[PDB]
Amino acid sequence: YQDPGRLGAPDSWKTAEFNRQWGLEAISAEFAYARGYTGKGITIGVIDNAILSHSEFSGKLTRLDNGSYNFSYDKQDNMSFGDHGTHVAGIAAAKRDGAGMHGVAFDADIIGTKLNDYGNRNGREELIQSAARVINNSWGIAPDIRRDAKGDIIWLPNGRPDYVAFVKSEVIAEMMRSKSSVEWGSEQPVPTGGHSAMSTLLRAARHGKLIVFSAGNYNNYNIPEAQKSLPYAFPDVLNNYLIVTNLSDENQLSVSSTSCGQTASYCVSAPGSDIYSTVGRLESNTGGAVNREAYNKGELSLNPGYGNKSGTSMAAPHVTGVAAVLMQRFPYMSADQISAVIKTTATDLGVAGIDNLFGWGRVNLRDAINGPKMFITKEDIPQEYYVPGSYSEKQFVVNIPGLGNIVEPGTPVERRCTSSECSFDSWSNDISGHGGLTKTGAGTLALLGNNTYRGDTWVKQGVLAIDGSVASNVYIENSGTLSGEGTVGAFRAARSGSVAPGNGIGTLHVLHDAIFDRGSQYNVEVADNGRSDKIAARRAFLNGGSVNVSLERSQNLLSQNEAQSLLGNKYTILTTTDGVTGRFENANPSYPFVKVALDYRGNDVGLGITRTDA
Ligand SMILES: [Ca+2]
Ligand SMILES: [Ca+2]
Ligand SMILES: [Ca+2]
């Protein structure tokens, strides 16, 4: 297969294979592909029916099971293959090989475990200890169906069973009653046979995995069950849970879909109606019965193919695929941070903001790959949907570790950061919300959006380059650097914190105060004819700090020859409208016959390359 997909060309990816699965276009998967993001090097876990050995998974599927496929029998032993797992796995990670359809994360690998009939190898603790980054759970418990006085199923005019509605207060009460036992269960390794589903998924979430669940197919008046309300008991894992509703098209829930309801603050919507994916079918070779007697006499074949299916079970793996693609885009992010990107970049549907039908809205890879749109705290969640104890962290802690460095050390998802996004990344999306940002790691993060997040910005390590704007106060600590040609609210550079305006020679704009503490660094680039770095601030407090002068993009302070070639040049390196208070400690470099000199003109600070009082 010669793939016509090309970097920079989203329409090049819209091939016949691509177009056979309408959900891909609906989540804008082609925009991720065009930027090189396919889920390559990412492992997805599936808990469902045993996935069929299918061409679409050849070389990329590991099963951890008791070595049999899942089969359902009726009263007369008519045998059928459970092709649910195969269908789910295909939506997330079928090969892009020019045949049939392909997954959202078409370069991702798959580890599959059996939901049911697992014997004494359920593979759960193995899955938890694997490098599987995200686990798809396209399963759950059905509520009662409403029955007539005879005991027959009452059907709604829409063709669906009249399911009884779960009640918010009752599902949350059931979860709260399970809390102490589920907490205990989650701390031990998962037994290989009988086991607690709730303890298993809590343990996986606490081992750094993203847990993705189908909302259920129990009608729009319905809400998710107690299992899917586990974050109410364990709000520490809310950011590692995503509940997924079923969209019949880009804007509308399937008539069968369960609503987000009480899970709305950790819920998104994805395509789930008439999804074309991988299946298997148990078939008679002799045009005879498909039953156990025939299976045993070798009369049957289990054949791979494709088929349509509908349900939140088909929506969930779109989000699992989206998560794997984003873990290649943002290899330094933890699962809770990948979750934040998926939630805050979803296209808002229905009632404005987070709502009981669509939650955060339709997952959108085109927006997701440009970074998060919100640093979420409790104050960003409508009270109706707020899970008590959730979103209590003020800071989004972004670790850009630098190429060759380990992230999530001591966890099953521990990995080396080996892509270019690990030394330099940029987020172009506008970031709002009440949270703040903490930049750590030796690498560089550039922010290009018009950011309104209310929290403080802490640069603890490496470079934060502001090219758009932040309304936030910035604190630059030891080994950190504030850079860029954009705007910040205010900054305070501490001992061994640096400010380096521009991308090379440029101006950093500060809406309020620029503060330099003792031992802070101001790295000024200069060129010919009074062109230099500058801070344009409302007001400045210089409690000390060193001004360090170099030529543009030079790794060293001015040499003696460079300084002498600039002798007599004057520069403006700091302007205020309301005044400069105090002075820098010193200005480097300084030589016997040429030095950098600082000139304090009341509202501005000048810099000269001057003689040494001679
Ligand atoms: Ca394919
Ligand atoms: Ca909405
Ligand atoms: Ca500069």
What CATH number is given to the structural domain containing 100? 3.40.50.200
3-state secondary structure 240-283: HEEEEEEEEECCEECCCCCCCHHHHHHEEEEECCCEEEEEEEEE
Angle subtended at Cα 62 by Cα 4 and Cα 324, rounded to the nearest 5 degrees? 50
Q: Which residue type does 487 have?
A: T
Q: Are residues 416 and 358 in the same domain?
A: no
- Catalytic entry in 28, 48, 199, 318: 48
Q: Are residues 347 and 496 in the same domain?
A: no
Cα 549 from Cα 119, distance rounded (Å): 71
Residues with Cβ < 8 Å from 186, sequence gap 6 or more? Answer: 199, 200, 202, 203, 206
- SS3 for 591? coil
For residue 534, the ligand closest to its alpha carbon is 3
Q: Are residues 382 and 347 in the same domain?
A: no
Contact between 189 and 234 (Cβ < 8 Å): no
Which DSSP string do the residues of 127-159 spell out, in sequence order? HHHSSEEEEEE----PPPBPB-TT-PBPBPTTS
Cα 549 from Cα 557, distance rounded (Å): 6
**Exposed / middle / buried, residue 52 (Cβ in 10 Å: 0-12, 13-18, 19+):** buried
Domain-embedded: residue 3: no
Query: Strands (DSSP E) along 408-555, which ranges?
Result: 415-417, 424-427, 436-440, 444-447, 450-451, 457-459, 462-466, 469-470, 473-476, 480-484, 487-488, 490-493, 498-501, 507-516, 521-526, 534-542, 546-551
446 CA distance to ligand 3 centroid (A)?
14
Domain-embedded: residue 505: yes
Q: Are residues 201 and 319 in the same domain?
A: yes
Last-in-domain residue among 368, 388, 423: 368
Indicate the pairing of strand 267-271 with strand 424-427: unpaired
CA distances from 23 to 31, 87, 89, 359 (A): 14, 14, 14, 18
Contact between 62 and 116 (Cβ < 8 Å): no
Cα 497 from Cα 481, distance rounded (Å): 6
Contact between 66 and 42 (Cβ < 8 Å): no
Q: Is 512 a residue of the active site?
A: no
For residue 508, the ligand closest to its alpha carbon is 3
Taken in order 388, 393, 396, 398, the sign of the CA dihedral is: negative
Domain-embedded: residue 478: yes
Taken in order 14, 17, 22, 28, the sign of the CA dihedral is: negative
166 CA distance to ligand 2 centroid (A)?
22
- Catalytic entry in 214, 265, 313, 498: 313
Last-in-domain residue among 368, 393, 421: 368
For residue 348, the ligand closest to its alpha carbon is 2
Domain-embedded: residue 355: yes
382 CA distance to ligand 2 centroid (A)?
11
**Exposed / middle / buried, residue 284 (Cβ in 10 Å: 0-12, 13-18, 19+):** middle
Contact between 86 and 49 (Cβ < 8 Å): yes
Domain-embedded: residue 5: no
Q: Are residues 558 and 515 in the same domain?
A: yes
Domain-embedded: residue 592: yes
SS3 percent helix, strand, coil of the chain, rounded to 5, is 25, 30, 45
Q: Are residues 433 and 322 in the same domain?
A: no
Q: Are residues 578 and 555 in the same domain?
A: yes
4 CA distance to ligand 1 centroid (A)?
14
Q: Are residues 358 and 418 in the same domain?
A: no
CA distances from 352 to 230, 248, 318, 356, 358 (A): 26, 20, 23, 11, 10
How many domains does the structure of the chain reveal?
Answer: 2
- Which H/E stretch holds residue 87? helix 84-93
Q: Are residues 363 and 382 in the same domain?
A: no
254 CA distance to ligand 2 centroid (A)?
16
Q: Which residue type does 253 have?
A: L
- SS3 for 165? coil
Give the number of residues written for the chain.
Answer: 614
Q: Could you tell me the resolution of this structure in angstroms?
A: 2.0
Cα 569 from Cα 536, distance rounded (Å): 20
Cα 345 from Cα 432, distance rounded (Å): 11
**Backbone torsion region of residue 483, taken as left when φ is above 0, otherwise alpha when ψ lies between -120 and 50, otherwise beta:** beta
Cα 483 from Cα 533, distance rounded (Å): 10
Helix axes 168-187, 197-206, angle to 10 degrees: 70
Range of the domain at 96: 10-368
List residues, by chain if needed, whose CB lies under 5 Å from ion ligand 1: 94-95, 97, 99-100, 102
Cα 572 from Cα 327, distance rounded (Å): 44
For residue 463, the ligand closest to its alpha carbon is 3
Structure token pair of residue 149: 């006085």
Query: Smallest Cα–Cα separation from 508: which of 557, 544, 463, 545?
Result: 463
Cα 474 from Cα 208, distance rounded (Å): 29
Domain-embedded: residue 1: no
Cα 221 from Cα 164, distance rounded (Å): 9
Indicate the pairing of strand 79-81 with strand 71-73: antiparallel
- Catalytic entry in 54, 84, 102, 207: 84
Last-in-domain residue among 308, 335, 368: 368
Contact between 574 and 524 (Cβ < 8 Å): no
Query: Smallest Cα–Cα separation from 318: which of 4, 39, 14?
Result: 39
502 CA distance to ligand 3 centroid (A)?
4
Residues with Cβ < 8 Å from 212, sequence gap 6 or more? Answer: 134, 135, 136, 137, 242, 244, 316, 317, 319, 320, 323
Q: Are residues 315 and 407 in the same domain?
A: no
CA distances from 92 to 276, 320, 344, 353 (A): 12, 6, 21, 27
Q: Are residues 201 and 79 in the same domain?
A: yes
Q: Are residues 448 and 344 in the same domain?
A: no
Indicate the pairing of strand 275-284 with strand 473-476: unpaired
Cα 402 from Cα 420, distance rounded (Å): 9
Domain-embedded: residue 287: yes
362 CA distance to ligand 2 centroid (A)?
9
